[PDB]
Structures are given as structure tokens and as C-alpha cells.
Write a protein that binds this ligand. Structure first.
Ligand SMILES: [Cl-]
Ligand SMILES: [Cl-]
Length: 162
């Protein structure tokens, strides 16, 4: 298992514009298009992202290309973030995948807002961090995915995904 296969399991793959759990226009592998309610604003962003007139539909390859960009940007954002970098540096390879997963879903700002949990992760207090991570809107809104991520932080294995 690796970051790509983990996120592919959490986000799925859809070749036609769809709405995410929050009601936002998305496509491919969890690629947010816009928070705007306009499907046209969404089609426009889509075409801008792909470099072609898509009419709201893309191919597998195109979906995978967006996915590669997004994971790269996620990693780079973490390493550029003063709050995230130290946590990330301190972790093992599996747990690093967990931070990347959160960043991809909720953005660097969002994750950086998990002050207390981050401090617990850095101190390697696994059980305590898992309990604190669960007291969040995140966990309440997408409980099955959050439990998976949380288990990864708690155990340091890919069990939740197997
Ligand atoms: Cl883009
Ligand atoms: Cl869920």
C-alpha cells in the first residue's frame, strides 16, 4: 500500500462532474473544482484544468494526471508549512501518508488548525492523538474515512485499508 492507493480508496474515481460530500463540484479522484454553486463555473474550471473543451467529462488518464498534481502539491505544501513540516519530519513513513491524506481532503490550513492533535503526534502519544482527532467536525461529517485515517495514526500500519 502507498499514498496513491490509499487516497484512491478514500476518494474513488468519477469521470463526470459530481458533487462531493459537502455539495461541491468535483471530478476524477477527489479533485475539487469550485465551491461555487454554478455548474458552469465548474465546467469552466474543468476546461481550464485540462486544457481542452471537456463538456464536463474526462478520461482515466486525465483523472490520473490531476491526481498526480494534487498529491505532489499536497506534499510540497506540507514541507513549506511552518506548522506542518516539523510534524511530518518527526513521523514514520506510514504516518506521513496519513498527514498527506488529511491535507489532500481538507487543505493545509485546515490541518494546520488541528493544533493539539499535531502536538500529540509530534510527541508520539498515539492513543491520545486518536482521541483528540475524533473531536472534530471532520470526524463527524465523514466518520468512515476519518476512522481509517485515525487508525493509521494510532497503529502505524495499513490495517484499516486492508
Ligand atoms: Cl488545477
Ligand atoms: Cl466517511
Amino acid at each position: 500500500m502507498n499514498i496513491f492507493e490509499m487516497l484512491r480508496i478514500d476518494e474513488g474515481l468519477r469521470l463526470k462532474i459530481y458533487k462531493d460530500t459537502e455539495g461541491y463540484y468535483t471530478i476524477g479522484i477527489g479533485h475539487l473544482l469550485t465551491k461555487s454553486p454554478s455548474l458552469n463555473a465548474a465546467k469552466s474550471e474543468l476546461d481550464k484544468a485540462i486544457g481542452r473543451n471537456t463538456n464536463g467529462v474526462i478520461t482515466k488518464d486525465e483523472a490520473e494526471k490531476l491526481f498526480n498534481q494534487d498529491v505532489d502539491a499536497a506534499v510540497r505544501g506540507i514541507l513549506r508549512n511552518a506548522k506542518l513540516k516539523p510534524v511530518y519530519d518527526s513521523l514514520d513513513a506510514v504516518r506521513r501518508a496519513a498527514v498527506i491524506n488529511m491535507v489532500f481532503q481538507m487543505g493545509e490550513t485546515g490541518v494546520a488548525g488541528f493544533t493539539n492533535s499535531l502536538r500529540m503526534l509530534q510527541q508520539k502519544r498515539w492513543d491520545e492523538a486518536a482521541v483528540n482527532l475524533a473531536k472534530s467536525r471532520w470526524y463527524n461529517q465523514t466518520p468512515n474515512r476519518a476512522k481509517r485515517v485515525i487508525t493509521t495514526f494510532r497503529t502505524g500500519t495499513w490495517d484499516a485499508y486492508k
